[PDB]
């Protein structure tokens, strides 16, 4: 019935969301590394001053 079907769809959302969390965390990590790289680049340029 309606409660079974809902549970079915929700079980799916959960799986989707759990996977989405791990992917967004990896992505954050990759972005923070991109930031660090360039944050260092700036301190170098920032001394030729």
């Amino acid at each position: 019935g309606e409660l079974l079907s809902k549970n079915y769809h929700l079980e799916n959302e959960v799986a989707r969301l759990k996977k989405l969390v791990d992917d967004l965390e990896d992505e954050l990590y990759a972005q923070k590394l991109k930031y660090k790289a360039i944050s260092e680049e700036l301190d170098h340029a920032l001394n030729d001053m």
Partner: protein, 39 residues
């Protein structure tokens, strides 16, 4: 993604050219001083 990354290294040796020539030119000014401090 944004801007220039190695065009960075392009105006970074171009900052090691317009400062390293700051003290080579802060040396020909000493040509009149190692010897001017002599007369």
């Amino acid at each position: 993604g944004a801007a220039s990354m190695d065009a960075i290294k392009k105006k970074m040796q171009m900052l090691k050219l317009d400062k390293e020539n700051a003290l080579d030119r802060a040396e020909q000014l000493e040509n009149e001083v190692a010897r001017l401090k002599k007369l």
